[PDB]
Every structure is written in structure tokens, then in C-alpha cells.
Symmetry: D3
Subunit: 303 residues, 6 copies
Amino acid sequence: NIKIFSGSSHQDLSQKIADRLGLELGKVVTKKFSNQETCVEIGESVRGEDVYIVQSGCGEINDNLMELLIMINACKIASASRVTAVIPCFPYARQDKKDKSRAPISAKLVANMLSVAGADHIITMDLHASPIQGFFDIPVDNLYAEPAVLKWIRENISEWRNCTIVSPDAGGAKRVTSIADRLNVDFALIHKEDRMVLVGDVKDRVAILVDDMADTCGTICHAADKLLSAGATRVYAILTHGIFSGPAISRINNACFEAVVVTNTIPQEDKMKHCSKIQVIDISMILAEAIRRTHNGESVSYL
Amino acid sequence: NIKIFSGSSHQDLSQKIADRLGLELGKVVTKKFSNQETCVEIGESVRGEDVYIVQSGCGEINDNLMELLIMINACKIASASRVTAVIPCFPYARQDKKDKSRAPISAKLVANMLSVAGADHIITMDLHASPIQGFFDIPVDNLYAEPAVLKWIRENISEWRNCTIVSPDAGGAKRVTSIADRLNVDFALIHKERRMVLVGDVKDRVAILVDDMADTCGTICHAADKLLSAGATRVYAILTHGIFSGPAISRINNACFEAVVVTNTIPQEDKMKHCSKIQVIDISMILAEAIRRTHNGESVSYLFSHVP
Amino acid sequence: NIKIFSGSSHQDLSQKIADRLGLELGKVVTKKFSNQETCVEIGESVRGEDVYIVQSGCGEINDNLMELLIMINACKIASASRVTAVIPCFPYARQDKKDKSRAPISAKLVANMLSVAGADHIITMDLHASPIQGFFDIPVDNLYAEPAVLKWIRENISEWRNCTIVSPDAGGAKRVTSIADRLNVDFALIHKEDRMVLVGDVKDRVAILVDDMADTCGTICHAADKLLSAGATRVYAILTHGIFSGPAISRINNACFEAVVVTNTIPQEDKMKHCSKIQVIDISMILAEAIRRTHNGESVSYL
Amino acid sequence: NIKIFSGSSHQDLSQKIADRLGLELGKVVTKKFSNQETCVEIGESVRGEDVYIVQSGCGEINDNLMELLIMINACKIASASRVTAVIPCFPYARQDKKDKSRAPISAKLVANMLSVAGADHIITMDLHASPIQGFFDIPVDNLYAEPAVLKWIRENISEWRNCTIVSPDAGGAKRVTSIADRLNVDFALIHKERRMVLVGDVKDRVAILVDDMADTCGTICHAADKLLSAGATRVYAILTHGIFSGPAISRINNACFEAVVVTNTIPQEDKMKHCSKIQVIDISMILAEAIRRTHNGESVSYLFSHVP
Amino acid sequence: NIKIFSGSSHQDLSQKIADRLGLELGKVVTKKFSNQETCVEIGESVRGEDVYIVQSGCGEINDNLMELLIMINACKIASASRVTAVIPCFPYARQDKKDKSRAPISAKLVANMLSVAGADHIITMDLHASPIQGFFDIPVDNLYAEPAVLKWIRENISEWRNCTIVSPDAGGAKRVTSIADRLNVDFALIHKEDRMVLVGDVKDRVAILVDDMADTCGTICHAADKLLSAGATRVYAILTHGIFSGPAISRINNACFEAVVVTNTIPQEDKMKHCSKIQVIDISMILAEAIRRTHNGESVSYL
Amino acid sequence: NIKIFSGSSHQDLSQKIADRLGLELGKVVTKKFSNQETCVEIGESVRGEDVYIVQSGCGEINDNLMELLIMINACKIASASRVTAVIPCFPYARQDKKDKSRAPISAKLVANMLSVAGADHIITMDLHASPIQGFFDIPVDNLYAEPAVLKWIRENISEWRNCTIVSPDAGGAKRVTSIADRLNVDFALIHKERRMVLVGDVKDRVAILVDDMADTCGTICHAADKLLSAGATRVYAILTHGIFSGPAISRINNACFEAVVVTNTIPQEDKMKHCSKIQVIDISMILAEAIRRTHNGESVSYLFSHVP
């Protein structure tokens, strides 16, 4: 009854999920015309089946979006019983408000686009902001990296019991306080004035920069510099969604971090090779467990 | 062309907005069925008219929301050209994410209800979480009370050049930082773990608590003690939406605030008889300016930093 | 597979339904913030389940509506397989037309609101007017009190075989003729001119005022006075939905009725104590039987 | 700005309405594919124009409805500003509730079909059941023929001050009572059990049967006998929509009516050649006034008691 | 679980389908009021059932459309689990574009109408043009007469291996080339200038006019005349959907055709009697097989 | 009232259209997040304005489509009166039917995406398959490049009175026949079986290949050889949309075309540096005329046979 397809050139998260549920990825012919046009063909019957599509991540976010949507549509009009988008890293997630601008709410657009394409259900992990669940009318099961992040800090940072979790921006206070509370450590927060400012006890104690995602690393790199000026013993970088394009990769190595943790929502294989301090948290079991429980009607709230 | 209406019998902000535009409020025949059903009649044509309905700060949120929905419908099926719901204090705004609970996202529900009732446009002020514009498909104008607040601090607080803007929770950091920056001053941040912890310098500085709303004032009072504990000279509380239900008035009067400042999105006339500390920023002109501009197609974003 | 929640402070109709199907009401935490805001939390997994919500009836119709809608939404975005609103007394049912006014069609609003909230199906009893089924695009199963009303008249009114069923208004002719036809008795009808008018043989015969609902009782009380002036032996009052607020309760006792029948669509417990002539028809078996048959795909048309 | 069109070839009411507004009917190229498919062409731009399409009383309801739907679509995808379907006699109106049967609510279906075809507005007259405005989300103007009827009774019936307004069924009580009250006279009510039973005094009074429509006239003729049986001096029948299909003309001519009065929502030109009793109230001005007002944004509710 | 209703006076295709699946057509009371108004009543419970409606074809296309839609709606609001429209001959299919006119896209209207009425799925055969699948948001399973047409040409036309398949219009090139390719024969095409023009080798070889549908036959009759002037040995006429109204019937007999093949998407029984050269391809097994496989979640792509 | 915007940085057709209407392009602040996310800002009010957004021929179709969608949304939630997406070359148009495959109908998907993003209207040119207007519910204006093509043939080809209009495939017959008829000349038809087969006379005639687009030019080059094989004097290729990706420029330069003619729906400035054969029909005036007319409510269908 259950069927899993991968949505890209990228099949390393998708294949990991299918193995854990004892399945083979669905047979799909995906091609790109010389004029950049995406061609997708479901090479099997998905009729009456419970279909799951895991998004790709070749670095290009529009191509990945379009193939995601094309696949959901291809499956819907082929009488799939239910289509879920399994999108650990929600595209355009930053654009969830106008921000004192004539700016799009692109997160709401993408939700409208996922809905109109045919999606009946969304599985995602650690949304930038949580109200993006409210952009959909369909059920959204948003998973948390929180348990997986906490487990790493406890098992890798030795001097954690008296460390400090730090937000790289103003709009990250909620997330770092929560991480701090569970570990009974202190928290701090950075705000770029541009001169950077720090608020919270960081002197002679392990500092861990936890954030949802870093693109150019420009913010998180200067965040490490500041923390070291403020006298933190050592510094870390936890980034659930690791986009890491352009100057980021090199910026991290010239940076002082003892370790830079990520989750394989975006494949670090080619970049782990160009940076040794990086470590990946496997989020496939969490995604596989959330697919089985969704298909069986079992509680995902435990996860 | 323009036509303003009010909800229930709490017609003060509506009248204030109506006054500033040189208009009368439109006639509504509205009593409640002893059954608790609301009956509305629109006592005049709205055919091809640019209608504005102002949500009433009476005090029963489900009654108010229902009446606002009923009036939006009445005008839409009476062939109004456009119905704009002017909702200074957006109901159920605090319920905008499931929050690792199995809860409804009530903000989205109210957004869907407003939409199907026939609403074409939204005018609102300082959404608890701004991302609520994303809960609609029709355009939303989210007005900032920030400018009006900054103007109040500059003239009512002498030590404003050296004060500290404080967030009572961790979800108000993006709000306190931007205010501190426009005044070019320090910011602080209180986080209640469940004890309050403060991060940022407030020693020998006036501290100004900034929030979107105050409801039982439990948090804002324990934050006043905390700030004065940490070396704050004096504590101000500034709220956009002042609900002050339950023990809040008892919370405010015994609290060590110099002053508690609220806009008149929720009426404060009675609450100032029982509480001297409460001062009111008049927002009616910002709302009036927003309606005028929406009608003439002129820039509403001009209000986002500039008090009319 | 089947799950039943109650929608209010009111759990006397809801618990009766759950007992009859051998169930416990679902665990739900409902709270009202000091600023009258409703907070609802489904304290269990409703995923893959066939969910039924029975509306509350603490006298307040907006609060009951909002919690009804909040619960349907809470269940829908928590991947409930199907949500039904079990609303014996359809809110705002009177407002099903403009009536030569710039008035809302609030019954259509409420239907739009129930739909947009997530409802897939509606169970209701004796709608004010029947076209309210046509306000929805989802299936509506409207049950009839008619069999339960007829059974009472036969088993309680001794001199029924030659009685007269009377409509308190002009727009009730259809309902009273039907009740009269099934019992092979005569019918009559009242119309307020305000001076009241009567049409139909009522002299020296049992009179039974049958209506869908009475709020202030103002109409139905003066209807009893008129019938007694026109010389009816004794007078009754059948009101499926008993709202009975404000002056109504006292108006009924100073009224001449031998009995005032209702159905427990709205709880009379506290008011039966303040009026002895009242009798309640239990509509729980009809609602419970209509839930089981809806869940099993069995015919409800028999009911 | 205004642009009126007609359906099929039954272009009399359309022309009458067009005449009263000083307009020509818009060019439509419309023949039927021998296959029974309808082909419509709009022989002119409607771009940014306020379009009105009048449903034709030709006589084949599914053909008429389809053509009305096709024309609404053509205008909408030709960038009309607004398309209003003017449907004097609303099709499938008698199917508005399931009725303890497993039947479709056809009224709602026609309402959904009109809506998705692209209709922005509805102008109609005396809906069999009024609650059909509730079957739409777009605004509906339900016109009353009542005023025109009352004016007809006052001048054509001398005994009107002492007559009795009769409902032929039990679903027409809310219609006969309101008419009786405006004339300040008695009302009666016939109920066919399945025999007719009459309640209310009609002795030595002119009796006036009032209905929304007449179709085979079975009911209205057995009601005429019944009334004269009960002591009625003479019987009139007044209908808003006069369909008169099947044996109705044979029913009318042998029936003891003094006169059978119908509006021209359904054409009566041929039916008066074969039946002398039939008199026509012209409704074209009420419809013309309704279109004019809808265009200028003036009060249409003025027509609800006042004949233009 | 499966239920089949016929949508008209016409029950010869519908009954053939039900027999092949071992079923009886659903009990339905359909009536037409003296004012041409359609009355339909589902004389049984369709609750929780997988419902299929096969359209009628009494020659009238609006009456058939309205009863089709009325039945889909009647079933949807009676809690049918799934409603499919089985419409071998898609109504208004010609009107799929404006054609340099202010013309309706009536095919899109009808799709909107089928959707809004309640349909969840469409089964159809050899659409005029294929993008009509794209007019729906629901799944559309469009079947092909191609295999059934090819089988007839091979088994009835003796000299086929060197014949020529001819399009009666310009917008039929795609269809005839495909038929020609599968049989390894040549193709030709006619275009009315009105003087007719021919392009493609037709001399002294069997000619077969293949088209989707002919109404007045005006085009296809003159197409036969031209082909005979151009010197084709014998001429045929393959028309999947045989509408054949007005002058068509007589035009075919005065025409020179050796045979005129059709499919019983539109009943030829009364007209086969008025023309002997006509032969019908039975499309009931294809429709019955497509219903069973849709209901069981099996592949229809094989068909 | 009118306001034109462009996509990405390919602002040539937008400027050309803007020039012909005596307007500047509206300010857009648009860089791409190194993450490949597009960020758009509308650097001016669009409140109550008739907005037009021109899809950019930059070359990355999913980026272009996304940016077009993002800009449509930005304008809609900034209370524009109307947003019209001007899409000369409609993306994913070749995917309009499943084609006995289990494929998406991408045309409909793009149509749904444009619709929910907030589009009120579509202006496009020569849809690969025209039936794409049927994929929308909002009005679509499908412009013909046909007139501009016919004008090009009449003046650039001397032998046009005796030429042959050729379809490179079998899906272009309804396009080549109508063109041949307006010039009153012969038509031909190439069908690649998978070898090309030609039907129709081309002996000692100039042959003109007519298509909706050219992409790798595989087909159009093998059709040129085929035509010259069959006795064609010389071969022209005329395309509305000239994409020329992959080996097309190598395909064109070695091919026996006299000339390859394209409209400027997709920019050709660079492609003419590398290929002399390529000539450009300017379509900007047809698009400018179409926008002007859409704004003033004047007939756009006038463009369907007549070059402005």
C-alpha cells in the first residue's frame, strides 16, 4: 500500500528512508529538457496507494520545488489514494512575513502551490517559524530536531552542564531558551546593530550557536568572532538545515569552531570533504518513523 | 463612496475614526435574541460602496467576532463594492501555532472565517505574531503602533536617551530590538523558565517594558519587580492592546510601574476610573488615515514610521 | 475507529450518546481565558479515526459555535479521517432568508463556517426550515422528531383521535398539516396581524401547539390565550428545541398548558425544576443510532 | 457601460427590458448543433462592461439553462467587468430540499452551476422558496411581484376591500398573509391531504388564489371548486410565473375562474390565443428598474413595495 | 461495495456493463415534469458505496447533462464514498478553445460543472482532443478506441496492409498518422478551402476515413466523394462517437461507403435498421474492465 | 493607473513594451539568496493600480516562473486593483496532455499556480496548443503572431504567391492551413514516424516551415533536408518562440535554411552574434497594444489579424 519516491537527483536521504521501512524507491523517470524544463514520469501504478515524496536538494530551490509539485500532481491525477510531501527543509521558509516591506509572503505562496498541486498532507522538520503550519489547510506534521540536537550536546560537548546556548539573531530567542531550559544551562543572544551586540553570560564557558539555517554563514561567522571576544572558552555551531553555499564553506574553516553540527536535510557529503569539523545528525529514522505512523494511523506526537 | 460601521454598542473608536473623516456611522439595527443570537440589519443601502466595519471592544470575543462576521455578510449580499474589516485588536491572535500540542491554529480559523464571510481586505494593528498576514489570501495592512509609541517615549520620558527597552518574554525580541535601535539605546530580555531570568544591562537606567498585549498582567508585574531588582531606576510598561481582564487592575495598582501605557484598540475609559496609572495613546487617527488611504489608493506604508 | 467528543460544559446528551454506543467521551481539555477566548486541546490521538462532535448548549450560542468550530479544526489538522458535526439544534437557523431586509443569511454563514473549519458531514435534527441542507456542499443527515412527537401525543393525550394541531405562526402550516395528517386529526393556524387571528376548527377539542423552537415564548404564550378564547377544551405545547431564556420560564407557568413537551437538544434539567408541566423526549438513541449507521455505512433513511 | 443580452430566440422580455432602458440587445450568434449542442458567439466586445443576461422563456428548461451558462462563460472569459444573470423564473426552484426522499437539492446545484460558470450577481423574481438566496455566495436580488399584484387587485377587483386571499397549499401561507395584511383583509388556506381542506372564512367573499407558479393547474382548479363550494362569490387565480404546460389550458378554460392573472416572466402570447381568461402583468419595468439601479448603485429594495 | 446506475432512458450500454461485472443496475426513479424539469430519485442507499454513473444518450445533450449532474449530486449528498462519471462521449467536447472568437470554452464549463456537482473521477473514451483531461482537477481515465479500431481494420478490410488512413479535417493529422503507423500503411489528409483539397497518396488503394465524431456528416460525406475522384479503390468510415442526427443517416446511404464503423457510445440500434453498411464495435468490456480496475486499484494503463 | 514590471534582469522586452506606452518600468529590488531563493521587493505602491508583469526570457524556466509567481503575490497583497501576467512564451506549454503516459499535465499546473498566486488575467502569444485558455478560469488573451508572420512573408519572400506552408509535425496542421489560406497558397505536412514523410506538393516552390517554437532544432533541420529532397527551391523556417538551446545554433548554421525567423518573445541578441541566419520580428508593439487595450477596455481581438 505504501510507496516512496525521491524527488531529485538526490537519493541519499530518500534511499535511507526506504531501507528503514523495507522498501524500494518507486520507479520514476525524471528528465530536464535542454531549455531547463522538468519532465517527470511515474514508471508504475500508484493507484489506490499511499504515496510519499521526499524532496531532492540538488542545490537549486526552484527546480526542486517544481519537480516536487510536478510529482505530487502526476500522482494525484493518477488516482493516488493520498499524497504527502516529505519536505524536511521547507522551501522559502524565511519569507513568512512582509517585514515592513511590499514583500511577498513566499512561504504562503509555496503552501498554496503545494496545496493546489494536490498534496493532502505535509511532513516537515524544524520549520524556521512554526506558524507555517497555519499557512496550510491540510494536516502538517512538523517534526523536531530538538531531541536529536540535545542528544548530541550531551554526548559530544564534555563541559555542557555549565554551557551557554546562543542565538545568532534577535528572532531566535524562543528557540535557544527552550534548548537552554532542557539542559539547565544559561542562554545568551546576539543582535547586529553594523556593530554586533551580545546579551547574556558567556565568559569562560562553552558556547553553542544554535540556529535553524545558515546560507552565506555571514551572520554565524561574525557571531563566533564576537563570542570569542566576549571570552567564551570554546565555540560550536548547530544548524539543522545546512544550505552552505558560496563563501560559507571556506568561512567555516577560517572560523574558530571546534565542531559544526548539521542534519542531513541537505546532503553534506561533498562538503564534509572540504571541512573536517562538520558532523551530521541522521534524521532518516525520524522521517521513516513519521511515515510509518502516518500510514498506520499511529501517534506521531511521541516523536 | 466610503461607509463606516461599528459592532455591538461599543461605538467609541468607530465614532472617533468616523469624526476624523468627517462622517457619521452607518445605521445598524442590532439587538440580541434572548437566545444569545445576534440579529443585525443594515439600515441603509451599501450598493457599490466602499464599506469599513470596525470590530467593537465590548469584551465578549466570540460575540464580537460573530457580529463582525454577520455584518460582513450582510454588506456583501447587499452588493457592496468592497468590505474591509478593520480589526485593531485581532481576535485569537495568540493561537497561531499548534505549539507541540494538539491545538487548533485559531488565528488561521478566524482568518478563514473572515474570508468566507465575504471580507475583501483587512486593516489591523501590531499582530501578536506578524505572520498572520500569511493566514489570508486577501490583502492585509498590518499597522505599527511603534511610531506612536516612540513619540510617546521621546516626550513623556526624560531619560529616554539612556533607557533600556525590555521584552517581557522571548517572543518579543524582534520587537524590542527594533525600537531600541530607532531610539539608539539598549535592549533587555526577560525569560520565565517555569523563575524569570534577565539578560542585558538595566542598571541605573529607566526600563521600558514593551509588549503586544497585557491580559492578567501576571508576567508584566513580575517583570517590573525583576527589573527593579536588577538595578533599574524606574519601570514603564507599554502595551498596544490593553485587555486588562481578571486581577490585572489589582496587579497594576500594587505593581511598581511609574505608568502603564495602552493604545485605545480596547477601550480604557472605565479602567482609568479604577486605575490612575493607565494612560491612553489615541490610535484613531492612524486607523482613520489607513481607511482614507485604502479608499484613495494612497500609500498606507507611510504610516509605518510616521504619525499622522 | 469511532470517537466521540462533547463540545461544551454540557455533557449530558453527549455522555448519553457515548453510553449507547459503548464508548467513553474523548479526553479533551477545554478552557476559557479571562478575556473570554476559547482554548481547546484534544488530549488524545484522533489520527485515522472517525470523529463525532456533539455541540454544547451552555446557553451561549456564539461560544458554543466557536468551540464547535475550534474542535472540528483541531481534529481536521490532526489528521482525523472524517469529522462530523452532531448539532441537533442548528445555530442561527432562523436567519435562512433576508425577509425584505438588508439582513444576513446567517444560516448560510454558519454553514460556510462549519465547512471551512473542516467538517465533512452534518448530523442535525428537525431544522427550522429544510433548505438549510442546501446551504452545505457536504452531506447533511437531518433527523426527524416527527416519529417521537407522534408517539408522545398518542401515549399521553387521551382525547387525541379528535384533536387539533395548531401552528403559532403563518410559516408553520407545512409542519402542523403533516402532524395532523398522520394522526387523522384536524389542523388550525394562528397569524398575528398586534391582534392575533385563528383559522381552523378548535372549539371543544384538545389543542396542541407544535413548533420547532420558542425563545421568549411571547408568541406561543399568546397563542395559548387565543386558543382558550376560541374554546378549546385543553391546550398543549410541543417545542422540539427548547431555548427558554429570559421571561419564558415564568411565562409558561402563568400559562394554562396541561403539558409542555420538549426534546433534550437543549438541557431542561435546571428548568424542569422551575416548571412541573414540562416533559422531555429523549433524542439520544436517535442520535446514537444515526452515528453508528453513518460510521458503518448503513441506512439512516429508516430513522 | 451597460450591456443586455437574451437567450435562444425568445427575445420578448429582453427586448421589452432593453426598450425601457433605451438600448438595443447585444448581438449573439447562436444556432444549435444538430447534435443538440448549443453554440454561442458574442458578436461584440464586452471588455470592462457591466453585462446582463436575461434567461429566455422558450420552454426547454435544460436547453435554456445550458445556454444561460454558456453565455455567462463567454462573457467572463471575454473580460467583462461583471456578469449578472437576470433569471425572472428561476429554474429547478421547486427542488430546494431533499424532502425525506433521497433527492438532489437541484436549486443549490443550479446555484453552484451559475456560480462556477462565472456569474457575479443574480436578479430574480419571487423565488418559490425565498431561502434560495442562501444557496449562493454572490449577492442575489429577489424582486417581489407582490406590489404589482396588489396594484392589480385594487383596480381590477371592485370587492377587494372585502375579499379573501387564498393559499392553494400550506407552503404559501407566509405569502398570502402578508398580502392580506397590506390590503387589510382576510386570508384562507387550502391543504390537499391525499382531498382538499380549507381553513378560514370565504363565505360571500371574492376569493383570490395567490401562488408562485402554475404548472398543470391540477391544484388551482380543484381549489376553485373548493372555494365556490365553501361559499366564495367568485374565484380569481394570481400567479407570478405562468408555465401552463400539459392540460393546464384545458384545466383553465373549463375551470370556474373569473380570470387567471400571470406576469410575463414566461411568455403568454400564444397561450392567450387559446385562453381568453389569461391576463398579463408586465414585469419588464420592474426588471429594467432593477438592472438600472444595479448599474448605478441605487437602492433596488425600493422596488420591494413600490411599482416603478 | 460497487454500484452502477444508468443515466437516462437509455439502458443498453449500462445494462451491458452491469452484466459483465455480475451486477444489477441501481434502482432509480427518473421523471420529467411537464415543464421539461428533470426529477431523479435514488431508490436505494448508496452510503459508503463506490458509485458509477453511465450517461444516457437519448439524443438530447442538455437533458442528458443535467440528469448526469443531478445524479452525481444526488449520490454525493447521500454520502456516497466516491462518485465517477462514466461518459464515453464527453459532452460539448468540440468547444475546447475559442477559435479566434468570443466563444465559450464549453468543454471547460462542463468539466467545472461535473466537478462542482460532486464528481471525484471521470471515465471517458477517445476524447475529441486530449487536453480535456487538463480541464479537470480530479483524476480522468481516458480510454482508447485505438486498439478496437485497429482490430477491426485488420479483421474486416482484406487489402489493408497497403491501405491509406485519411483525416476529414486539418485538425485530425495526429490521430490518423498514429493509426497509419501501427498498421504500417500510408496516411493522407483533407482540408476544406468551399473547395476540398487532398494531400497524400490515395490512388488505387483502400481508403479509410477515421474520425472522432460526425454530426451532420456534411464533412465526411464530401470527404468520400473527393477520395473517389482521387481514385481510391474503395472507401470506409470509422467514427468512434456516432451522433448521426438530421440528414446524416440518409447522407450515408447515398454515400458510397462499403462500411461505416462506429462504437456503441451512442446507440445505433434504431439507425442500423435504416442503414445496412453500419457495424458497431462493442465498448462495454473496455468500460466494464475500466470500472473493475478503478474500484480495485488495479492498472487501467494496460487498456 | 497602469504599471508595468519585469522579471529578473532580462529587461529588454519589458523596456520595449514600456517605451511604446510612454512609461518607465516599476522599481523592483530583486537579488537571489545564495541559496537560490529569490527575493523580490516592489519599490513602490501599487495600491488600486492596474499592474502588468512581463515574464523574463533569461533562460532558467523554473527560476523565471517562481519569480513571476512571487511578484504576482507581492502586488496582490499590496492591494493592486488587478495583476495581469504577460507571458509571451508560456512555460511548460508542451506538457498539456498525459499522452498515454503517466505524466503530469504541467500546463494546467502552471495555470493553477498562476491562479492561486493571485493572477487576474493572462496575456500570452501563440500557445503551443491553444486549448490552454481552457486551463484557466480567469480570462486569457491568446495573441496571434500570425498577422506579423504573414506581413513578414509578403515583403521578405518574393515567391510568396507560389510558396508552400509546411508543418514540421502533425500537430501544426491547423496552424499551417489557416496561414496558407490567408495567402491563398499550398500547404504541406511532414510526419516523423520513428523517418520523415511528407504529404503535399513542394516541387519548384519556396517552402516555409511554420512552428510554435524551436528548441534543439533537430526536427526543423531534418525537415529542411526533406523539403529540398522533395523538390523545394529554398527553405525558410518561421518560429514564434525561439528558444535555441543545446546544439540548435550548430543545427541552424549547417542547415540549408535561407533564413530562420523568430519573434522576440525570447531574446535573440546574443544568438545573432553567433548566427547570421536569425532575423527577429519585433512583437513588443503587439504586446504593448494588448496591454493598452486591456486597460482601456478596448477590443484586443482587433490584433488577431491586424498588425498595429
